[PDB]
From Swiss-Prot, chain A:
Xref: InterPro entries: Phage_PBS2_Ugi (IPR024062), Ugi (IPR043805)
Species assigned in the record: Bacillus phage PBS2
Domain of life: Viruses
General function of this protein: This protein binds specifically and reversibly to the host uracil-DNA glycosylase, preventing removal of uracil residues from PBS2 DNA by the host uracil-excision repair system.
Identification of the protein by name: Uracil-DNA glycosylase inhibitor
UniProt cross-references to Pfam families, sorted A to Z: UDI
Swiss-Prot record, chain B:
Protein EC: 3.2.2.27
Localization annotation: Host nucleus
A single BP term in Gene Ontology: base-excision repair, AP site formation via deaminated base removal
Name of the protein in question: Uracil-DNA glycosylase
Amino acid sequence: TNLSDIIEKETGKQLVIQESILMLPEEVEEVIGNKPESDILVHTAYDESTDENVMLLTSDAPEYKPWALVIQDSNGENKIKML
Amino acid sequence: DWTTFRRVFLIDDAWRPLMEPELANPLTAHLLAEYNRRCQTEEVLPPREDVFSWTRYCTPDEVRVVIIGQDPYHHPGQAHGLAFSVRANVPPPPSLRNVLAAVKNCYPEARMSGHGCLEKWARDGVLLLNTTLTVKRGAAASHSRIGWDRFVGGVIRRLAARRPGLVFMLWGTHAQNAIRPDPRVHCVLKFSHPSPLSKVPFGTCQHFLVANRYLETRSISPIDWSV
């Protein structure tokens, strides 16, 4: 539900989130470019076909509000989309 | 209480001295209460028998390396009680693939199974310990506020005091701020999370190499990181 549906609406793919890692704004600010207001839960799925890691960064539980979507290719290059 | 606690959770006895002192904390009683009220209206992972499987692979004295995690994987079948570890019939999640990647880089002579079940390491003295021991199926960080971390902290604190010369691998700021071991008595190694979002590729982490170089100086044998 919710979160995974978002990944599909954004990528089209039906990906299953495999882990959710908690990161602080400074750890994130470093990569996304922007600094979130609070702690970020990075939900990561892996699209084996394209061999990309699809990461849906939301806010912490229990809110889980979508903040940015990040697609990283096999060569570590990111495609960031602020939601 | 220890006999009953140990009963419910199937905790190994070697861990009695580090855990027992914590039951007597009123905040622990409430933690257990909150845990039990939850299993009644929510699917909690991992299964009750696995919540403390980390106390079963080696004794507190056999411990050599302590790796800290956050909460358990929330999709059923994944988690089995150890940080980062996944049951053998489950594909290694993204962070685990990077951890396993950093291992092969340090030790290229290693024959990896391609699998992600870390119970081999646990048996060797690597304590893969999360600070939040349970999670509701499908909700991440759902039990992160019920008090598991104050508890786990209490046990690590005792472990560190009882056995000098432990190596600690703290990945990500969260883990670094959570556990603050004495750095004059123990080897505290810090790094960015193994997550793929991290600015620095984890495959460049040499903690497994430094950990062993350290164990060499204290006359303890190195851990075989291959898995």
